Amino acid sequence: QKRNSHRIPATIPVEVANADGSIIVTGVTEDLSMGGAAVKMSWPAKLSGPTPVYIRTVLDGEELILPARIIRAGNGRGIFIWTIDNLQQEFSVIRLVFGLEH
Numbered sequence: 001q002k003r004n005s006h007r008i009p010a011t012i013p014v015e016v017a018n019a020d021g022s023i024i025v026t027g028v029t030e031d032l033s034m035g036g037a038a039v040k041m042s043w044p045a046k047l048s049g050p051t052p053v054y055i056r057t058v059l060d061g062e063e064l065i066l067p068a069r070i071i072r073a074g075n076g077r078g079i080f081i082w083t084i085d086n087l088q089q090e091f092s093v094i095r096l097v098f099g100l101e102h
Contacts, residue, residue, distance in 0.1 A: 005033040014057040036081035043073035
């Protein structure tokens with residue numbers, strides 16, 4: 001369909017793990033959108049390509065855990081797209097992006 005990004009530049013601590021737990025790093029966000037995230041961070045491997053991860057952070061006292069795919073890593077920067085497989089995942093993304101607009 002068609003999607004507005006609701007790109008919101010914001011700086012918030014996040015933790016990122018790949019799906020098998022072999023990699024775990026910390027960082028801060030640069031921007032968030034309905035599409036994904038840009039994060040200041042250093043990924044310790046070369047990306048084949050879109051690699052499934054979990055992103056964890058806190059906002060307004062709430063823990064938010066969002067599945068995602070890292071799609072690029074360029075030291076100082078990790079780029080992600082959200083993975084949304086249900087309503088709770090859809091709304092965690094909404095809570096994050098609009099929670100930051102608020």
